[PDB]
From a paper:
Upon endoproteolytic cleavage of the gp160 precursor, the N-terminal region (fusion peptide, FP) of gp41 (Blumenthal et al., 2012) is liberated. The FP is hydrophobic, largely disordered (Guttman et al., 2014, Kumar et al., 2019), generally but not completely conserved in sequence (Kong et al., 2016), and essential for virus entry because of its critical involvement in membrane fusion (Blumenthal et al., 2012). However, bnAbs PGT151 and VRC34.01 were found to interact with the FP, as well as other components including complex glycans nearby in the gp120-gp41 interface (Lee et al., 2016) (Kong et al., 2016).
The bnAb recognizes a very similar conformation of the FP on the Env trimer and on the synthetic FP. [name] also interacts with other regions of the gp120-gp41 interface, including a contiguous region of gp120 (residues 85–88) and glycans at N88 and N241. The cryo-EM structure of the [name] [name].v4.2-[name] complex suggests that H53CDRH2 and Q55CDRH2 make contact with E87. Here, we considered whether this feature may also shield the FP from antibody recognition, but we found that [name] recognizes and penetrates the glycan shield at glycans N88 and N241 and is thus able to access and target the FP. Compared to the VRC34.01-stabilized FP, [name] recognizes the FP in an inverted orientation (rotation of ∼180° along the FP extended structure).
Numbering used by the authors:
A (entry chain L): 1 to 108
B (entry chain B): 512 to 546, 571 to 664
C (entry chain I): 589 to 664
D (entry chain H): 1 to 52, 52A, 52B, 53 to 82, 82A, 82B, 82C, 83 to 100, ...
E (entry chain A): 31 to 59, 66 to 136, 152 to 309, 312 to 321, 321A, 322 to 354, 356 to 395, 414 to 464, ...
The structure:
Amino acid sequence: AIRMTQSPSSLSASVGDRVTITCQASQDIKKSLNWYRQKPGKAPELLIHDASILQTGVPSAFTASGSGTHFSFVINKLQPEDVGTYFCQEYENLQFTFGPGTKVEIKR
Amino acid sequence: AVGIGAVFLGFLGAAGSTMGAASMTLTVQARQLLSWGIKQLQARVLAVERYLKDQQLLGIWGCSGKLICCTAVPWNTSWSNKSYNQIWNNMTWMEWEREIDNYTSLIYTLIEDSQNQQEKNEQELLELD
Amino acid sequence: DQQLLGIWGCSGKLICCTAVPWNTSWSNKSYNQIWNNMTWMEWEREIDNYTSLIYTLIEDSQNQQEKNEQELLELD
Amino acid sequence: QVQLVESGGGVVQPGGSLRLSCAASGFAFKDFGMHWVRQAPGKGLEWVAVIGGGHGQHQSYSESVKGRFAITRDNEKNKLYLHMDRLRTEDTAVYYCAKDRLGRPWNIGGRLVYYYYGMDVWGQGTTVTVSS
Amino acid sequence: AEQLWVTVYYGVPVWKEATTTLFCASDARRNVWATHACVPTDPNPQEVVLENVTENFNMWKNNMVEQMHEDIISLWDQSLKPCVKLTPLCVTLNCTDLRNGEIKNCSFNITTSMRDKVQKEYALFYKLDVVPIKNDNTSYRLISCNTSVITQACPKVSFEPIPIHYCAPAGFAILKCNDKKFNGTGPCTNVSTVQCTHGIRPVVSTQLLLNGSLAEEEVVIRSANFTDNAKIIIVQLNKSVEINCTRPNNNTRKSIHIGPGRWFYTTGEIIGDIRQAHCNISGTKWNDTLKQIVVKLKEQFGNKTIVFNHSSGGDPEIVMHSFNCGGEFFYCNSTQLFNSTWIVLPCRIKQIVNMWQEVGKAMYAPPIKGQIRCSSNITGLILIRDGGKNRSENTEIFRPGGGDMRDNWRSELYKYKVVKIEPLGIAPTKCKRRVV
Ligand SMILES: *[C@@H]1O[C@H](CO)[C@@H](O[C@@H]2O[C@H](CO)[C@@H](O[C@@H]3O[C@H](CO[C@H]4O[C@H](CO)[C@@H](O)[C@H](O)[C@@H]4O)[C@@H](O)[C@H](O[C@H]4O[C@H](CO)[C@@H](O)[C@H](O)[C@@H]4O[C@H]4O[C@H](CO)[C@@H](O)[C@H](O)[C@@H]4O)[C@@H]3O)[C@H](O)[C@H]2NC(C)=O)[C@H](O)[C@H]1NC(C)=O
Ligand SMILES: *[C@@H]1O[C@H](CO)[C@@H](O[C@@H]2O[C@H](CO)[C@@H](O[C@@H]3O[C@H](CO[C@H]4O[C@H](CO)[C@@H](O)[C@H](O)[C@@H]4O)[C@@H](O)[C@H](O[C@H]4O[C@H](CO)[C@@H](O)[C@H](O)[C@@H]4O)[C@@H]3O)[C@H](O)[C@H]2NC(C)=O)[C@H](O)[C@H]1NC(C)=O
Ligand SMILES: *[C@@H]1O[C@H](CO)[C@@H](O[C@@H]2O[C@H](CO)[C@@H](O[C@@H]3O[C@H](CO[C@H]4O[C@H](CO)[C@@H](O)[C@H](O)[C@@H]4O)[C@@H](O)[C@H](O[C@H]4O[C@H](CO)[C@@H](O)[C@H](O)[C@@H]4O)[C@@H]3O)[C@H](O)[C@H]2NC(C)=O)[C@H](O)[C@H]1NC(C)=O
Ligand SMILES: *[C@@H]1O[C@H](CO)[C@@H](O[C@@H]2O[C@H](CO)[C@@H](O)[C@H](O)[C@H]2NC(C)=O)[C@H](O)[C@H]1NC(C)=O
Ligand SMILES: *[C@@H]1O[C@H](CO)[C@@H](O)[C@H](O)[C@H]1NC(C)=O
Ligand SMILES: *[C@@H]1O[C@H](CO)[C@@H](O)[C@H](O)[C@H]1NC(C)=O
Ligand SMILES: *[C@@H]1O[C@H](CO)[C@@H](O)[C@H](O)[C@H]1NC(C)=O
Ligand SMILES: *[C@@H]1O[C@H](CO)[C@@H](O)[C@H](O)[C@H]1NC(C)=O
Ligand SMILES: *[C@@H]1O[C@H](CO)[C@@H](O)[C@H](O)[C@H]1NC(C)=O
Ligand SMILES: *[C@@H]1O[C@H](CO)[C@@H](O)[C@H](O)[C@H]1NC(C)=O
């Protein structure tokens, strides 16, 4: 699996703002990308699979797009409830590598 | 990401998958099946008879050399009213053979008594004229 | 022997052409350099260690193809 | 409902061993492929290993664990196991069991292959500490 | 639907249960089971899982145990065919007690030069091999005198069990049940196909199963029906129990002339004190084994039920535990293992024996020179129910027992099933054959 990178490592905004996470592959992975969100004390929650499709039961508060090497996760409005670390995972090959993770929090 | 086996079906495993998918390894399964002294001697002769029995029918039916051959006997939907896809993409070999177990001798008879008979009669007539 | 000749599509023939290409790694001799210059005893020895390889290729590749494509052509 | 009960953890010395056992119900454990992942304190989530569904005729290990860990499963107990042998202090992490979106042994091309599309179901893991 | 036409397929992976003969195979090298004709084993056998398919196993229907039963007996009789008849040795014996009584020191006078070189040739005889003549001294003679002509086993035949494998013939296959919890029968899920089985040694014993396989990480107890007193209970042990057996007596032997060109071996003198045969069994391993067994028995037979009393039931060869260490048949009192309800065994040796049951002709063991030592372990055992009782969970006296020697192979064969594979079949297709 191709190493994934995420940026910025520390992402913050006021409540209600539109917040995005950059994620890239060093090599073309075509589409094999999942987005997870971790909250303190809880295993990472799958929000989006196949780089764009929301997981069943997940509200339409998030989107994602991109293909090839350039991807992005979009938080339509950042609420206190959405604070957590978002992970960019590739599953093209049987290493299912996770990216570094980006911490998203509320400005204070 | 996909994990893969080596090359092909080991032995019989496909028997519980759809007949469509299972058809892929008929070449494998056929080859494997096709191929103290006195007891073994008896077994050898029996193996030959079983081997040749199948070859006899495949010869007569015009199927020799094939593991898949089309006949000219129509399917009587009384035997099963399932469509092509309702069988091949939805039922295993073990299940299918049971479904039509009681029609085996019927259809085998029809292949020989009707089609083989026709093909041999008409063949001579065509060669003559 | 009859089993293999049947499977290979060679039954009834003592000479049958296959659809397996000759890998010149086995021998780089030309057609005439073999057939007009070498005996059966000599030839069989030259490629003795490729017998199982080529036999496998005939069945695993060509026979497999011919049976798969045959059904597909009969269906459509 | 679906619930993973993940236990077998605790504290071991480097050079020792344990085995984790993730009991699960609410789904066809016997059919779906499973994952192991781990998260060390202060770090992100590291993938550990995958086992296919059915009898588990295919595996893959992270280079960080290959040769030191083994994956197996019991389809009657509905338990997923991680054999944590010859451990080092670097192996301290919370380990999780997870289910792949599919993981099934498809009959394609004349052979069985396992299609994975990533974890989507899991429990909360258990802490395994390796220290002295 | 589509117009459908019949299509013939060959190589169809379907099968039906069938019984046939499996070929023997052996790690090729006059030992009874070391037949000169047997297929060398596969150094790299294959096993494949079915997974889409399950199968109904029933260990009580595996007819392979019958093949082994008959073939093994045949091999026994064949190897020991050109052996020495005891017919002229039925002469009565003038016996006294051997000073140190299970062994008598007796004389006789036969054949008295019937064109040969013979004499009285006094010798030692065992109590268990002779019948008293209560109208004489008491004097003794061969117990076989009023039954049949028996032979002394050929000295050149070894009786060491051989791990013979068995493999499927063409057109047939062996399926294996890999469910760790599999008992007498059921729809085993983890089913695989095996080209050829592992080797099973033809160990013959009563009450305990020696040198077999172990259970899958716990004691597993099997039966056709735990409620039916007419059935037996088969116990497969988690870990085996260590037993060390010995024949401390250092014995000599003598060849005697019994006719022109004919010899017979008799027990000669004994060097050192004459002591009892016995086996030493680890009480730790035995008791801990029982603990696990009792826990499993509770699942069916009650939580406070008293189990495992002394040996009882059957003739002396059923009541005693039996084995053939060193070629001599030992019959030991297993009561010392079951002498306390919910370790040194006293033991005697017999030479005129019956391979599971023998009619007419039978085998007499030759004397073995020197001392006998061996080591084995209990890997399984057979329990029998004592009979009708108060329904209340008070007692269930699981005595050792079992005289049907076929169970010594069935206890391993339970893993396998043999089927016949039918490659010919048909299914509908889309088009007609392009017939001219
Ligand atoms: C459904 O039923 C099937 C059928 O029983 C069952 O699968 C079987 O599971 C067992 C247990 O996992 C498998 O046994 C293993 O087999 C391999 C095969 O070795 C042979 O083949 C290789 C090929 O290269 C040769 O090199 C080799 O010399 C042999 O010829 C063994 O290598 C395994 O041994 C290791 O694992 C054992 C685990 O207890 C150890 O005790 C043993 O000492 C070996 O340990 C070594 O390797 C470990 C690897 O993790 C390592 O951790 C150790 O430290 C040490 O280095 C083992 O015996 C068997 O093959 C399976 N059968 C099939 C057909 O796949 C399924 O489990 C069951 N399914 C369910 C759901 O219940
Ligand atoms: C024991 O036997 C069963 C038989 O049912 C096996 O399970 C099925 O195996 C077949 C292949 O052997 C699988 O077939 C594939 O299905 C895909 C459809 O996926 C859609 O539908 C399922 C419905 O559950 C959804 O879950 C899924 O998300 C999708 O919505 C097809 O797309 C596949 O097509 C492939 O082949 C064609 C060939 O031309 C290619 O062109 C295609 O591009 C593609 O590669 C294929 O038909 C089937 O999915 C399996 N079922 C399940 C539920 O997974 C068992 O796996 C088997 N067990 C063992 C031990 O092998
Ligand atoms: C359960 O399984 C165990 C293990 O297989 C069995 O115990 C063994 O049984 C064999 C039977 O032959 C014993 O082997 C004999 O050992 C004698 C002395 O042993 C020492 O010397 C040999 C020399 O090779 C070493 O290998 C061994 O390790 C010791 O150092 C040998 O002298 C014997 O050979 C003589 O007798 C035979 C009789 O047939 C002649 O044919 C030979 O030519 C030679 O004259 C023989 O090799 C072995 O010692 C036993 N193990 C132990 C620890 O004692 C159990 O019997 C078995 N139980 C059941 C129920 O079957
Ligand atoms: C252990 O034995 C029990 C008792 O025989 C098995 O349960 C029975 O299995 C048969 C198989 O055809 C069924 O017809 C019965 O209905 C079952 N009885 C009950 C009450 O379940 C059981 O399956 C065996 N276990 C295993 C793993 O084989
Ligand atoms: C045919 O497909 C349906 C889909 O739900 C399934 O329920 C049914 O069991 C299938 N038939 C067979 C033979 O499995
Ligand atoms: C091929 O022909 C040449 C002609 O001189 C001869 O020397 C050589 O031996 C031939 N090869 C064989 C196989 O005989
Ligand atoms: C046995 O020997 C003694 C020796 O005195 C003799 O008295 C006795 O009669 C003998 N018995 C038989 C069976 O002849
Ligand atoms: C079976 O034996 C193993 C040996 O280590 C032991 O750990 C296990 O507890 C035993 N099973 C039972 C039911 O006690
Ligand atoms: C039982 O005895 C055999 C004799 O070779 C030995 O190999 C085996 O390890 C023993 N079993 C146990 C559980 O110790
Ligand atoms: C039995 O005793 C004799 C006495 O000389 C001795 O030579 C022989 O070695 C002994 N045999 C055994 C097995 O102890």
